[PDB]
A paper describes a structure:
Like other hCEACAM family members, the hCEACAM1 IgV domain serves as the major ligand binding surface and is characterized by the presence of two anti-parallel β-sheets creating two distinct faces, the GFCC′ and ABED faces, respectively. The structural basis for hCEACAM1 homo-oligomerization and the formation of higher-order structures is unknown.
To understand the structural basis for higher-order oligomerization and clustering of hCEACAM1, we solved the crystal structure of a tagless hCEACAM1 IgV domain at 2.2 Å resolution. Taken together, this oligomer crystal structure revealed simultaneous interactions through a primary (GFCC’-GFCC’) and secondary (ABED-ABED) contact at an atomic resolution level thus demonstrating the presence of two adhesion sites on a single hCEACAM1 IgV molecule. This involved six hydrogen-bond interactions between the residues Q26-I67 (using nomenclature convention here and after, where Q26 residue is from molecule (b) and I67 residue in italics is from molecule (a)), Q27-Q76, Q53-Pro(P)59, S93-G63 and N23-Q54. The residues Q26 of molecule (b) and I67 of molecule (a) mediated two hydrogen-bond interactions and formed the central site for the formation of the ABED face, wherein the side-chain atoms NE2 and OE1 of molecule (b) residue Q26 made two hydrogen-bonds of 3.0 Å and 3.1 Å with the main chain oxygen and nitrogen atoms of molecule (a) residue I67, respectively. In contrast to the GFCC’ interface, the ABED interface did not involve hydrophobic interactions. Interestingly, molecule (b) residue S93, which is located within the FG loop, made a side-chain to backbone hydrogen-bond interaction of 2.8 Å through molecule (a) residue G63. Specifically, we observed that the GFCC’-based interface in this structure exhibited twice the area of the ABED interface. We therefore determined the crystallographic Debye-Waller factor (temperature factor or B factor) of all three molecules of the human CEACAM1 crystal structure reported here.
Residue numbers in the entry:
A (entry chain A), B (entry chain A): 1 to 107
Write the structure that this text describes.
């Protein structure tokens, strides 16, 4: 049931897009966002620990993103290579974790 | 650097296999094991929270597996459909998580 929608879907180069999260579960340890349609550490954008409120960037961090405490992801100054899928993984306290995929298109 | 090796690699139907974990990082919240070569909640075997020492089964749990506190995974009474890839994800305190893939073959 966790979902993400991009706002806007079609984004103009140089403008911004918000990946808005819906149905965020409770009893969470943290968030991890990835570029592409799969959880993979080689393409992690950012890790975020809820208790300490610490964001840590990953290999796919571009320096134009902001993760908020509700797990939504802002990307500013979009370029053509931002186009595609993004994957949010949410880590539950029982370690039975949940993923959701979003997407947007830069024109 | 996290890795997993199956012992034995080639496993006889009805016998057991241990997915032994190496280089387990420190400062971990938990473990999640998956069937297949990717982290995906629809194929989660088990979630394990280190602090409370609780295992919770996922959709791909067969009832023949045991995860230990060092993250190694025993599978007993193997069948032909156990053949293939397994994926361990390790959740770090900074949420910049690590994955490793193992495999074995049932003959």
């Amino acid at each position: 049931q966790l979902t993400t929608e991009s706002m806007p879907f079609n984004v103009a180069e140089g403008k911004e897009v918000l990946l808005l999260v819906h149905n965020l579960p409770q009893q969470l340890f943290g968030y991890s966002w990835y570029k592409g349609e799969r959880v993979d550490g080689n393409r992690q954008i950012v890790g975020y620990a809820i208790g300490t409120q610490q964001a840590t960037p990953g290999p796919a961090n571009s320096g134009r993103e902001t993760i908020y405490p509700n797990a939504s992801l802002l990307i500013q100054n979009v370029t053509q290579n931002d186009t595609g899928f993004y994957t949010l993984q949410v880590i539950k306290s029982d370690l039975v974790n949940e993923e959701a995929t979003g997407q947007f298109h830069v024109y």
